[PDB]
Ligand binder design. Structure first.
Ligand code: ZN
Lengths: 90, 183
């Protein structure tokens, strides 16, 4: 129709939810919150390592091709970290 | 039987940001390793997310108007999701496409199967949002499920792994998320 706002009210009842589903729902809450809090943490450190290496390399007046090889050497080891974290049997 | 996720339940917690930092390819990191880790992560969390609503997904197969089908060449909503989840698990643990040894690289098929793995996850996203979303609201999980979909969709746009057309059943939700669903 048009841009009109809609609000709805719910019974909000976790009753008659077959026990296990109630317990399973609590597990995903913990897992999702831990996942996204750690996901931001991983990305922050990944960027902090790169930027700190970049500013460090311009500090020594290195050739651009030499900095890229050093930065690409970090990315390889960063890529090794991702493959390692992907290996799982949980 | 469609359900309305466009109500005030368009509240997403756990999404202070717009997912740009955790989706964007990390600079100098191999592009294959980045996709391979996130796809496995999405499958692991989606399989567990479906596990809480699996009790109440019995015959009634997909959403309104658009009805997905695993039956053609050579099922109820519980059947096609259970087969798709098991299938993704086989491909995601398939050392052919997802090698765990250090020297081995991803094959040429890798890019296409990732496209095949993502769409099934979106189709599994469809039935839960369309038919089993009001139990998510009972369990106070709309905060986590909304942010999980916005992260998943932001990942789809960023690397263009999913066609715009394919998102038709959940397109109104994606448009509503424009502030949290990446631009
Ligand atoms: Zn169902």
């Amino acid at each position: 129709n048009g841009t009109i706002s809609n609000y709805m009210y719910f019974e909000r009842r976790p009753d008659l939810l077959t026990k296990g589903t109630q317990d399973k729902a609590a597990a995903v809450k913990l897992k999702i919150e831990n996942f996204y809090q750690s996901s931001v943490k991983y990305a922050i450190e990944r960027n902090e390592r790169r930027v700190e290496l970049e500013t460090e390399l311009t500090s020594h007046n290195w050739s651009e091709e030499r900095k890229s090889r050093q930065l690409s050497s970090l990315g390889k080891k960063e890529s090794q970290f991702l493959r390692l974290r992907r290996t799982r049997l949980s | 039987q469609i359900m309305f996720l466009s109500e005030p339940f368009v509240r997403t917690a756990l999404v202070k940001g717009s997912f740009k930092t955790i989706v964007q390819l990390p600079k100098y990191v191999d592009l294959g390793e980045w996709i391979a880790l996130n796809v496995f992560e999405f499958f692991t969390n989606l399989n567990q997310f479906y596990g809480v609503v699996a009790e109440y997904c019995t015959p009634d197969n997909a959403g309104p108007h658009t009805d997905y089908l695993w039956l053609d060449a050579n099922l109820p909503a519980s059947q096609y999701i259970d087969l798709a989840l098991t299938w993704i698990n086989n491909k995601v643990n398939d050392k052919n496409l997802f090698p765990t040894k250090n020297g081995l690289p991803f094959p040429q098929q890798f890019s296409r199967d990732v496209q095949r793995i993502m769409v099934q996850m979106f189709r599994i996203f469809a039935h839960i949002y369309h038919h089993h979303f009001d139990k998510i609201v009972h369990l106070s999980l709309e905060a986590h499920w909304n942010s999980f979909f916005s992260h998943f969709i932001s990942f789809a746009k960023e690397f263009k792994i999913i066609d715009r057309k394919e998102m038709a059943p959940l397109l109104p939700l994606i448009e509503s998320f424009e502030k949290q669903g990446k631009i």
